Amino acid sequence: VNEEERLINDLLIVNKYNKHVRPVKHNNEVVNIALSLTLSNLISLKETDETLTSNVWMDHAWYDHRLTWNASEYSDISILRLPPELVWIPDIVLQNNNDGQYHVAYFCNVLVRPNGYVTWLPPAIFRSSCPINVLYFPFDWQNCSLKFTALNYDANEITMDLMTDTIDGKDYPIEWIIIDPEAFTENGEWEIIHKPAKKNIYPDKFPNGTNYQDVTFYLIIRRKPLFYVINFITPCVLISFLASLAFYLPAESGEKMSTAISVLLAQAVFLLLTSQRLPETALAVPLIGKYLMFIMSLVTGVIVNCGIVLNFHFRTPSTHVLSTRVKQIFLEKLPRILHMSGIDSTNYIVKQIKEKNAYDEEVGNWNLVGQTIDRLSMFIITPVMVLGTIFIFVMGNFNHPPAKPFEGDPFDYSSDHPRC
Amino acid sequence: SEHETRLVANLLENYNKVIRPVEHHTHFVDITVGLQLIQLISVDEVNQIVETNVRLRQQWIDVRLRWNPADYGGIKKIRLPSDDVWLPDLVLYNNADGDFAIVHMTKLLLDYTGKIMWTPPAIFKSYCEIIVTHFPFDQQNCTMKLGIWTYDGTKVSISPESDRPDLSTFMESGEWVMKDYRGWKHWVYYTCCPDTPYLDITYHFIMQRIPLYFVVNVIIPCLLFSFLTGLVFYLPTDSGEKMTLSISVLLSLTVFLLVIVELIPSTSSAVPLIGKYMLFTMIFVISSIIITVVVINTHHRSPSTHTMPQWVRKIFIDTIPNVMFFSTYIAEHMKSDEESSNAAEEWKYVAMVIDHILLCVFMLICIIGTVSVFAGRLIE
Amino acid sequence: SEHETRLVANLLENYNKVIRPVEHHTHFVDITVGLQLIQLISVDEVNQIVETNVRLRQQWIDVRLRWNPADYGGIKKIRLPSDDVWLPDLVLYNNADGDFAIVHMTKLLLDYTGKIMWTPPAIFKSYCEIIVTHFPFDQQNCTMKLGIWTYDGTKVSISPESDRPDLSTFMESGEWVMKDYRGWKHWVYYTCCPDTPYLDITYHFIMQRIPLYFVVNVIIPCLLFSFLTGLVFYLPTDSGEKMTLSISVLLSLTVFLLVIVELIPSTSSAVPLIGKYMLFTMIFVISSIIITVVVINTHHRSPSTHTMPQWVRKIFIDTIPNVMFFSTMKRPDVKSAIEGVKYIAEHMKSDEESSNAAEEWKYVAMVIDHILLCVFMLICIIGTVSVFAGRLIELS
Amino acid sequence: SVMEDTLLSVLFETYNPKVRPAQTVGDKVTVRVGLTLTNLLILNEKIEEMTTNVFLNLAWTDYRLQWDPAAYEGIKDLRIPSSDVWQPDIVLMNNNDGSFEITLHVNVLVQHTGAVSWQPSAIYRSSCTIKVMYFPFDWQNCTMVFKSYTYDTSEVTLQHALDAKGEREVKEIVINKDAFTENGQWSIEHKPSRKNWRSDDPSYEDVTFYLIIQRKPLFYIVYTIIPCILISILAILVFYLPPDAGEKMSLSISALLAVTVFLLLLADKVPETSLSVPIIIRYLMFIMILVAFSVILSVVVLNLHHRSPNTHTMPNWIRQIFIETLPPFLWIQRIKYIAEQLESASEFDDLKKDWQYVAMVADRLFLYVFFVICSIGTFSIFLDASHNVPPDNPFA
Amino acid sequence: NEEGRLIEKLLGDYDKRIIPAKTLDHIIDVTLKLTLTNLISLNEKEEALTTNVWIEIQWNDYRLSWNTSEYEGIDLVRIPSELLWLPDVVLENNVDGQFEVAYYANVLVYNDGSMYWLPPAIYRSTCPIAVTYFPFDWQNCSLVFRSQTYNAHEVNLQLSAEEGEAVEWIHIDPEDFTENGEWTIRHRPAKKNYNWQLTKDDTDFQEIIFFLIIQRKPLFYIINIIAPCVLISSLVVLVYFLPAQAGGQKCTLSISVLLAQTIFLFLIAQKVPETSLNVPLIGKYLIFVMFVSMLIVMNCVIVLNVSLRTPNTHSLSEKIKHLFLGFLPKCVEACNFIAKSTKEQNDSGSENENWVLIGKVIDKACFWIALLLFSIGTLAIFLTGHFNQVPEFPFPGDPRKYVP
């Protein structure tokens, strides 16, 4: 018959294998668990909930001296398969997760070698909580970490470790989220860059506690802003540049205010669009948000200036008098500095004609004042708008994650170059 | 039945569901895996997750579950709970937000020769890439990859039931069309262990999107806006409604951009075709408004300050109308007014001529842009 | 406690949780059922589901669990997991999207006389009719129908612990106020079995919605739009901003219609009061636009091509203007040179008379504008009062 | 055979985790309960609940879990699965969700003295009564009430958890310096704890952890306060435009449309509670009323500008006030019958310009009045929002 | 309590994994009877139907029977369903992975062995939406119950019979049933169905289908979208009475009505099914009114261009003027130059008056055409929906009514 049943009965039943007892000869010693993470695919990073949903295969390995046998004795059985419900497993738990999952999703069989070496690769869907650095949205990169801990045993009983591959000759620790180049599908609007892994110890706490050791797998994910550049960015900057042209419209055609105010309405619509796409954090205003505020205040200033120009255009001698200094400075400096381009009835009618002509000439002077202040405001505002938007978006575009995943560590965690 | 009660008592008396159902550990248990797609629940292009209602079909042989039918009153087949026997660890390698393996644990049929046939239902949220380039006239090739998680070749063998997944009971999706569906089996070897093949089966479906919804909800209003933005040029500049018309078309297009961002998938892998067309419409409206501002400023040119260039007068007033077919103290003060009015009228005539030229060119460019963006993929 | 371990082991030695806890099969177990409401989780008017957080209180007597306290060191009460003893299968008869029975299965107190006192928590998503007619000034009567599912009278008798549900520890809803809460016990007989009473207990609450949120968030902007609607008639037609004002207040009303659709529940059982008012405002604005188009058309009515009717003159020149006391209404070449001046004089006279007829049309347009402004303000006030006085008077 | 297996076999030969440890009948088990907040996930004000990642810190003494470590290989402590030992079900009573128990069920730690220590992890969704009066410039006072769901004060005694040094007693939510995620939106101010029994029911000992979280309003500022300020600036500017231009309505009513758009933006964030109006909503309504009054006064100014002698006669009182009183205080201070017709037209135009000057004076007066009103209202609202600071005393 | 020893005797040798069959080739009948309690919601966005149903399943397990004379007259015993064999009747056409019932109530074993299981359940069944008349539509979707494990050679699904006739409906209680408030049940038939392409050895050969013909109450849509949208779109015909005087704001009104229609397009797209087999009736009306609004805007542009022509810009030929004026029955030298200028400006004004008249005639004719087109289109589109009603028979070919 099958020898596996006899081997299982010998290992688990005859030998009184206690599932709840740590697999160690003496209570004083420690059990080393080497674990690794394999990112099957990055499902999503919902910034409105600050939730990173990912699918990861978690690889644990340890030594259970009770699960050992003489291979030659039991018909040369090399590998053995056992459900987790029958053997001791280390409950490595994702401590930081907004959803209360805390565990792998499958609990697949463990593989046991005759020398006691046990490996286990359960898959899991993890919804971890990582804060969103929204400073340079949408040209931003996020730093989301998965923190695994051993909350059932303290560091004096089990010590979590990074798995160490055996490269030609020596063994090198695996300090990265191993990702299959062939069977990995790149996520939309997110690309992984550094993906380091590190085991951390906190000396301020004591070994006889569950807070002493952690294993953290970090993900530095850069957002692809193509969707935002196509939909939110380009139309908004185009509408802004359109508002910048309200000065070129003559005051005679009564749409000077209408275009600017309708551009303001369009920017309000864009503000409504962009509000629904970010978390309500207050670390800093997002790049899109602060650019939107800048351009909205600039459009409001353009509206105020257009109102002032219109007020100056309809000044009349019956209501206002142009002072000598005002018309002097305007009509002398600004066009040059801006390179602009019976018989009693007859007597009465001629007098009225002359008075109307003088009134018309003063109205024309007011119109010229309006035109020249309009051109001055255009030359002051349009360069400001263009330079401001270019500076904002260039500063956003130049935002890249640092070449090294950690601050002072020069190692540049990567599967290409292992250490030790 | 008493016979079936006795039979089931005898079968599972010394049965160990942990042990693989093979007489010798060197041999492998051969499992035939088939899939039937009951319904395609949904496709999520943002997360690239396809939710499908499927039913697996595992057929294998357990030599420990063999009995003589004549010894139990002619019993040929019985139904056992799945948890009471050994089960293969089929796992959807493309899983995303869904259950990796079979979770419902439906009962299974058991012949008197050990031939177990198990047909459990499942909901697969497979993670297949979405090539959103010809959206909504796109075709998604989407796969689901099954295989044994813990065991491998020479321990368990996975073979397809047929070259094609079963689509007999497939409820029509209404939003996608199954162009072609196949299933392949792959052996993969590793240099670390070159005599232990790893077996898997990938079932792939070609889904052609029905574009009527996205057409009627996105493209048609975009067509209306792109047709109307080129219509402001037939409007005379004397009416003060030219800029109001242009900017109101712009505002309507902005609100419809809100609509499309509500509708279309928010993905950054590539620019969707309707996204490209919407950007084209935005550029068209912006250019139309800028040109309208230029035309209005030309119309309101004061001859007292501006002397019309000789080349402008010559080229426009001479060439262009000949190519068209439907367009043409008190005394001294009055003469000056008449001369200024005549020069301003010449300015207005130039504005009208350039307005008609721009109307014609913008109608032509609207036709070309509408044709160019869509006709590339519409040729099928 | 070793005494308590011995007692628990002794009680559950021969105990079948399947079997009803009665001395003889003919008798019935009399569970006294009380319900205490901790908070009102939500009220969804679209699906007509009221989600409440409640705690049940079942008291019954299990004669199989009686023991002598003096025989176990004086133990008077113990705590046992509910999964170890028989429990009555109380089910919410009007459940919707929620659990039909208790699923938490907390521990239960047990006296030495066999009195089980079980107080498990629950979230009840009761299905009760939502009468959305006076929304947001509505009063919803909502019930929860607990019943013993498999058993019946003379087998399992349910009884109400108190005349009213316990609301002592009730948390204030912040959106509803419990006007009156009661619980009734119904016997139902079916003609097939005339001596087999079926028992149930229905707890009903009368909840009065607090309208401050909906009033401020919806009705006030509707009031503003309705008020600004009539204002278009005080704007003179000489300005070209009449139609822009009317259509722009219409656009603002449309955006606020988006807001209203977002806020108020979407249901088709009846037209809510707030929906009636929104439709009234929409029709008011539409009629204002129609009327202002009419007045614009009669403002620009050409004098030459439209002879002034006599009846409109008599009505809108002296009769109506004198009525409005509050307003400010008014109530070779040598001979050619001389001929040319006569020609321009005749031209001026003709233009002056044409302008006089035009301003007659303007005056008629302004008179009807004032009349329509007054009638529009009055109709706005009376419409608001009529739509919102049906309940406010009743709620007094 | 590791002696830990033998120790476990000895401890649980007759151990029953269904009875509380009372060495003598009538003895109360003292349980110390504390909290360790690892991450304050969210405070959803739409449903008025808070989701927090916590570590409950329980410590009691089970006299049955005692052994001599010298009799074994110096096994001072042991790790037992939680389900194999007795445990007081210290649950969160004020949970908005239906879940009472913990989520993780980590192993319990047992010393040879019997001091069982348990640190399970949980994702708790506790109901928090949102004081929505100053939203978003508000400080919320959320609470988490932990107690044994079944054991009353005559069976268990609740205490505060001791520190790492056993000398002192911790009266606060222990926040781990590392492995703690600071919430972006909320800031902790006080995190005390108190055992708060109620007088009416003697057996209601329970431990309550308070969180005084102050909101950082930067998001709501940048998305609603500044746009409303710009709209207010536009509404004030409306009265600087000349009536002849013809864009007073095109500006004011479009500002109203923008206010409606901002209201639509805010419709999805403000809490759905009708106890009071959020200060942000009050500011939005104040701006909307101001824009409506700007529209009304611009309509009045336009009507005054187009008034004509052949349509209106200037009254004595207006001609007095708006000519001889306000301008001082507002810094304005201004061939045969052809001649006869020109003179008559000149007089008519003079009176028309008098009407226009009255309109201009009224426009300037309204400009100043609305500037003052808007500035005062905005300053008062912002002052009230700023003065809302959580008290230094937590009232623990 | 005699129920104690009765239960102990019944379940002493009871195996819940064995289908009860007195002998080989014994098909046990399983009679079903649905009872709708609350039609929760038809979600057209995901084409799901959430319902609450009490499903009565009656069968006959011969193992659980007793001689009632031996015991003290007990003949009806309640046993938890977790301890007994069940027919495993599940809802096959569920959107989510929920097949079994939601409560697992006790079963009422009788003296003869009959069983009367009555589980309440909450089902999200699939419901393909016919969007061709939305929102004036009626949906015809069903609940399909079948044995998940046993086939037609082991069990026999069939509709129950109360008083000698089969109950072929859903049996909605007349008194204790509140209407869904958006949907009204018009027909509720039930029938046993075969596939006829599967052999009766397969479990899917037989099924029991309960249909639910429901009609949506369009009151919410009519009162919040359709009526406001119709009122807004009715304003495009006023544009023909506004003057073409450069201040009448014709194109402003037309284009702003178009903007409002775009806002309503957002509103409808927020709550319209995404099936894409047909375009909804409300979507057809929206497309129609936006196309007629585009035509109105084009017409306004043409009228403004025709009525604002000058002799220097556009020459007025005799043919056009004749057509549009026939088919509408529906110091001495200083003064001389002054007179000449006055005459020439008067002539220019008189010439522009002709173009103004042409614009007026076009305005009136196009007003009549546009009003006719808009009224006919609106009436037809919103009358087709009104006349789309549930067929008077649950099944077209069957003369039966399927009503108790």
Side-chain angles (χ1 to χ4, degrees), chain B residues 248-284:
Chain B
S248 304
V249 171
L250 182 62
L251 281 175
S252 303
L253 187 49
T254 305
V255 180
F256 190 65
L257 192 153
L258 179 146
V259 183
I260 68 155
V261 78
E262 180 72 23
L263 288 184
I264 76 176
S266 178
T267 169
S268 303
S269 60
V271 200
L273 203 149
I274 51 173
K276 227 172 303 179
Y277 184 64
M278 189 277 306
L279 200 151
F280 162 80
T281 310
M282 279 293 306
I283 300 288
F284 197 14

Side-chain angles (χ1 to χ4, degrees), chain A residues 1-2 41 43 53 55 57 75 81 106 108-109 121 123 125 189 224 227 231 248 252-253 255 262 341 357, chain B residues 19 22-23 25 89 95 97-98 100 127 149-151 155 240 247 251 266-268 278 297 300 305 333:
Chain A
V1 300
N2 197 332
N41 41 32
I43 304 308
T53 300
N55 189 333
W57 307 341
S75 297
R81 275 65 187 247
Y106 187 26
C108 69
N109 304 295
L121 186 61
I125 310 122
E189 86 189 52
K224 289 174 288 184
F227 170 85
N231 283 342
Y248 200 59
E252 314 168 12
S253 61
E255 320 91 352
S262 306
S341 182
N357 185 271
Chain B
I19 299 309
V22 67
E23 55 92 6
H25 71 90
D89 307 322
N95 184 77
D97 296 0
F100 285 88
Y127 191 94
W149 189 258
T150 67
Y151 300 94
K155 290 297 186 300
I247 313 290
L251 281 175
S266 178
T267 169
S268 303
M278 189 277 306
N297 201 319
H300 287 297
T305 67
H333 183 250

